[PDB]
């Protein structure tokens, strides 16, 4: 008698596609087995019976990597309406197969404890693979031990510091310098939420004092100048500390320019525009419909200058902005409405997880500013290299994870709350038409989207641990450490 092992069904054959990686495009068939890309070539020898997808005339590209989601973060006591299960389903529907969610400790909760609560929730509800950033809401004298445990034991290599939310989680410049020096020693990436909280607080007061209580008060109290200044100050502190810097939620021309200028001076810095900053503008804060206007309330806000998106799109093309995220963090109209009488009480956050891939295509590729290969770079590959999971993600290559999008550059879709996969009533991209969309989405070698139908398994998604010292970040950083030593300076 033979005892026969079971062979798992996360196997498929994709025929006829134009494979698009960040370095080149080429024509070949793709054989997936056990959730991995097993062969890439012509006239591939493959088992009969195998699920077969004909990708002819279409592209086969790595699944999107959303570098920023906030699917479980508490905001003014509110739980986001799209939780890990709905968020990751929405992600898959838009061609994203991996998300990086922000762990945000509630008051009194340590970083490790918050990390464990996130893992508990995500491991049982994630429809696609994921990993976690850890947000530092309070500095204290020994939190280096927490950071150290997180990077050595829990597969985390990025932490976020807040320059805003005065009297809550804002850091001082001294504290920032100290945290960035620790992050550097640990081989981790320093993220920032870059707005001057003290200035925001002063404007919010003045505005409320004059009865400007609607959502336009939110954008008015977060002028572009407080983002640009905070980014510049963060860059400055990071540069002095030789700590690699990652600027979250790049919403303005001024913030993006500061990053581009820093890069020209050799600063190790990354910028993250999000779907909202590429896809809409802040004119809607002044909408006669309060609920619509509130739907845009997020920090930094969607910039009211409608030339912003095109500018940000130019800087994705030139390599100054390297990754795209959503910062997806949604609240219903009822949730937003706690701030009906005071914009400062509106829970901040907006949509973007589902629209990211198509909006990036529409703004960048369909416009002629960038090509398909650059598109892969800024939607998966650069993210994978920055956060240290390349080429596991962000590459159609033998041995990589079978997270694949069969992409149709000729498809067009009008975004609407009528058809979106979110638990909220408004979509900040209502009525925007995008060129480019997924035809098929594959996650872990299984079809998640085909012929307009979703096939998801909440809890199938796995945690992806991330080693410290990613080369793409740290080779420069370590050379600069060694030079400082040789030259006897800090």
């Amino acid at each position: 008698k033979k005892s026969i092992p079971r062979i798992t069904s996360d196997r498929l054959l994709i025929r006829g596609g134009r494979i698009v990686n960040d370095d080149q495009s080429f024509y070949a068939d793709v054989h997936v087995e056990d959730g991995l890309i097993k062969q890439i070539g012509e006239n591939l020898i493959v088992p009969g019976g195998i699920k077969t997808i004909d990708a002819h005339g279409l592209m086969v590209l790595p699944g999107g990597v959303d570098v920023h989601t906030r699917l479980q973060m508490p905001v003014l006591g509110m739980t986001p309406a799209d939780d890990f299960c709905q968020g990751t389903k929405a992600a898959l529907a838009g061609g994203t197969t991996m998300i990086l969610d922000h762990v945000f400790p509630d008051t009194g909760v340590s970083l490790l404890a918050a990390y464990e609560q996130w893992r508990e929730r995500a491991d049982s509800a994630a429809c696609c693979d994921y990993s976690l950033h850890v947000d530092i809401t309070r500095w204290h004298e020994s939190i280096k031990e927490e950071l150290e445990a997180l990077v050595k034991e829990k597969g985390v290599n990025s932490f976020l510091v807040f320059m805003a939310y005065k009297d809550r989680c804002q850091c001082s410049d001294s504290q920032m310098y100290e945290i960035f020096s620790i992050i550097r020693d640990l081989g981790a990436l320093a993220q920032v939420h870059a707005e001057n909280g003290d200035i925001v607080e002063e404007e919010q007061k003045r505005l409320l004092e004059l009865g400007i209580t609607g959502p336009e008060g939110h954008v008015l109290s977060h002028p572009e100048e407080v983002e640009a200044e905070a980014v510049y100050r963060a860059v400055t502190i990071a540069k002095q500390a030789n700590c690699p810097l990652y600027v979250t939620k790049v919403m303005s021309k001024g913030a993006a320019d500061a990053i581009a200028q820093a890069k020209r001076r050799g600063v190790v810095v990354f910028g993250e525009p999000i779907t909202a900053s590429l896809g809409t503008d802040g004119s809607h804060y002044w909408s006669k419909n309060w609920a619509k206007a509130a739907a845009f309330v997020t920090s930094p806000p969607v910039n009211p200058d409608p030339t912003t998106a095109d500018h940000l799109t130019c800087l994705l093309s030139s390599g100054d902005l390297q990754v795209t995220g959503s910062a997806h963090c949604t609240f219903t109209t009822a949730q937003k409405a706690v701030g009906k009488d005071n914009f400062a009480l509106i829970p901040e956050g907006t949509n973007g997880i589902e629209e990211r891939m198509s909006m990036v295509w529409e703004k960048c590729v369909a416009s002629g500013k960038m090509d398909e290969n650059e598109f892969v770079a800024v939607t998966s590959t650069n993210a994978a290299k920055i956060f240290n999971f390349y080429p596991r993600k962000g590459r159609v290559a033998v041995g990589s994870d079978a997270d694949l999008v069969i992409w149709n550059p000729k498809a067009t879709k009008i975004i609407s709350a009528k058809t979106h996969n979110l638990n909220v009533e408004y979509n900040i991209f209502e009525g925007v038409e995008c060129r480019g969309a997924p035809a098929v989405v594959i996650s872990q070698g299984r079809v998640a989207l085909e012929d307009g139908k979703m096939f998801v398994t909440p809890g199938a998604g796995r945690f992806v641990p991330r080693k410290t010292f990613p080369d793409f970040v740290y080779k420069r950083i370590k050379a600069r450490n060694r030079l400082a030593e040789i030259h006897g300076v800090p």
Copy 2:
């Protein structure tokens, strides 16, 4: 019997000069009486006997206005070596006839009390006219009343805030915003000492930790980036508050560029390069001679990039930097030497009061970057318009004060401690040769310098009170206030 009044001897006739104002140059004679310019013209009818100066082939221009001196400020317990009497003598020797000195309250001393101590000392020792800025070293809840008394009663219309000196006189961004809003309401000018004190403090520690205890540790702990960032943050807060901003001690390209960029965006901001930033560079911090190196220790430091001066000179030419000062604040070698073992204990401050006019001429006019008229602008006229004593100063015009320099554009002088009019042993411009120098200096209608000899009267110099709301500053500011009201915003 007739009772005959005495006619005072502050009268003279200057013949044959090329009068140079900021708007034009022209040939005419100048008649001074009672310390004022009484007539300007050809074939002037004037009393026989009058002291007569032949200015033929030479220029007659307004006396310099040094917008920044620190002749009585205590630094680490040390009193500056050139006090009000020696400082103003040195000023007159270099063609400056008015100084604006900084009142700096010692700990426990109110602004009004410090103002009164400065007036007591300056009124009895000043060789030329003067006025006072008031430095705010501590924020408290009612200091608006002090500021208000100062501008309404004491002829002060400018106050300085520090962004550096952590744990001593550094303000937070909230406090800065609140002070700038008060300064705006009072019609006064907000000056800043623009360096990020928190970052400076962190670098100083790291450097001392590695035993870099010499004066190069001072420049190394105050990199250009902390000046540029602080200037940008100040500009940002000033702009939000609609408060006119004046950046003191512009020493770097980055700081100057930030101001130039702000001006292009319509921000009401002024920049003040000083003699040291136009005349030398920071290579001397690394001098084998400790005493020489220490002589350069001042904050912000003299920039080590030797292309800095030429850049600053370009921005004086383009109108982005509008005034020149000295920040003169000198300490002997023995005084500096308290920091022999720790650069952070070296009292900060350097020379420049005597060399300002000639160094500006040498760098700006003798190079062909600017003309004689622009030279007057950036050495007296702009200062007079900013601080609200135009055309009393900064103009050869009937009714203006007779503060006049007979200027020789062909003279050349090598600066040296061997011939300078200071009480210190080193000169940061040792061996620098400048084209352009005063032949005659007239203060209050009396000759102070002639044929290389000084004629000074300590205590002759008067306090010049300065009204609030100078048009050159505030017309824009007030229009913006009115527009905010019309548009129902802060």
Copy 3:
């Protein structure tokens, strides 16, 4: 018997005004006699009977100096609809009292002959004072003698070179360098019409080839890039030749930025935005109404980017753009309509002479970007200093010409062809509302506008001759000549 001379009636008393010069504002009465300002003061001793104007609550400022008009230039065989008489009347109605018109020699006509034809026409028809620029349409080997006669005998100190109009009046870079070297030696100002004619010609062909024959073809064939490039190339050649450069018709952000960057590098260059570039945008080229669209056809075109005007207004505020003109050159709808089937046959030119002062006030002063004093600078004073008739014009000062505007900052007017003083049916500012307008206009000491009525005398206007080597331009240029000699280089 006494023989009694006649005393002329170009005398008046203006009481109660706020005098506004470029350097300061102040309250005083103004006494005009014989077309000159005779006294400025309080309690002025003046003849009884004198015409008296009460300017209380209003401003008294120098009459505008329009640095660019084209009132007699032939365009595609067409004579402009507003000739010297109508143009200068329209100018006076908008508070401009001096114009600088461009002499443009027809084919076969020498510069001197064209100059004489312009003088003949202008001397008998000008309602206000004027002077003449001379446009060089053809380079030849001995034209230096013409230029020399013009500056030595005919009171001309500015000449214009064309970089556009390929095969007609475009110069090559060699020729430009040679002309600029001659202009420098003569002490004259080199103006440019800065567009790349070769590129324009290639785009015009492509566009006509695809049947884009409407006025939008005109703007499409003159993209912003050809202006910016030509300005940069002109700046470059001027800098190498040490020849002062004046850029006419600054219509784009790119052109203005090039000038601002040049000034920062110490280049002697002036920029001239015009009413059209501050007051409207190029969206109207796409108007369904052909006649409206054609009304905007001029080169360089009105930029389609509607953020342009605000940018140009920022650069007037920062001092990078120093003068304002109209380039007024109007054609009726019938005249424009020769190009009904081919945009390249539409005669180029648009309005602006009447609206310049109010549009500059509206965009610059009423917005809070600039103050009243800066307004005088960029509307009269800087022009007077550049072209060498300061302080005869551009200053309320004793001995200056009595060209004065009693200006009402609170007046508002909607511009319309229904009320304009032009001979054409369209106004490119139709429906634009401006704050700020003249109440009274005085030219040569006589009232030209009062209570909404014009009082003009065609032929009263005089030619104003302009000496070479204006200091405001040439002091820098001559210093640089002397330095080149000292250093043994060109």
Copy 4:
């Protein structure tokens, strides 16, 4: 009886190396067979006997691709001293395994005929693989047929246009636009030699007129401004034509900035700094030793501003400058000396082919500005993608050509004419010390350099034909063509 085929000896095993590609580094062994990389992995199954190289502790990277050589170009009648054989030997000695040489037709010689002369010479003398750019020295009406034959039949996809050499090979702007439109239609890359020839010619005359006949006259007649302006004008014309642009010999900050600004506006443009612009400065033109100074004479010249190299190195780091070349074109002292009495008669050209890899490492990697992966990008990979031979070159990957450098980052070498592999007496990098050098160089799977000894076979090098429409260039270009069609514009 068996008839046995011969197995060629271009086989080897490289063990223990850190493989460095532009996307990642990783540890693996490399098996080469038949001049190709056959396997990459651990525990590779390989024939016994095979030549084996132990690369432990060292890097294995793609051989350099020198995008610019001029080894056979005639200059003032002179043949370069390092011909194809010596040049390619020198290249291999410095870790470059592929060169792109410029075909330059002598007067009266067609492009095809010059191409055939280059192939004849290179095929029999090249020690490494090569390809050819074709320089267009004269525009004529039918030269499109030559260009077309070259790209369809002769494996050429890049052509160079000259903006300098007035009256010899300079193109006008019209001609440039027409050539760029043809190049675009053919799928080829437009290169430029970007200097304003008309301005250069005028300066050269002035300088010779004042007897400045030495080599400093060469740099003085080619100021940075003529490069920056010409690059901007080229960018402008390329953008209007939608033709991809490649700027050769980027020597100045101004030229590099123009390219960086263009990229930010979405222009398809590449920049090529060369060894000389990264490795030395133009102070040497003023050397007391004429022969040394003449050794630097090349166009554009080595910039006299010694901060230039660091700036260019920053822009390689930020991605604005993507490829590095040598422009190697050497002449002996005797050859240079024909210009002993007139700098304009000195044959232009300098060294760099041998030093490129080490100088790029020294300036970019050893300084901490860039990492090893970026180094591969700018020394081989980007070149391969631009000119359409990726991944055949520029990648350690199975199936790619076995052109490999075993690189030692810890080696240091002082460059000297005493040890260089050139036929000239001077080296413009004399005495420069570089970190980083080749230990072993492999070309076509054969060792060319080992233990400091060269092993070369003149004529082994092959011509590498290059298809049109490289994706890395043309995907953007073709999208923009399609958008123009959709929108009915050129």
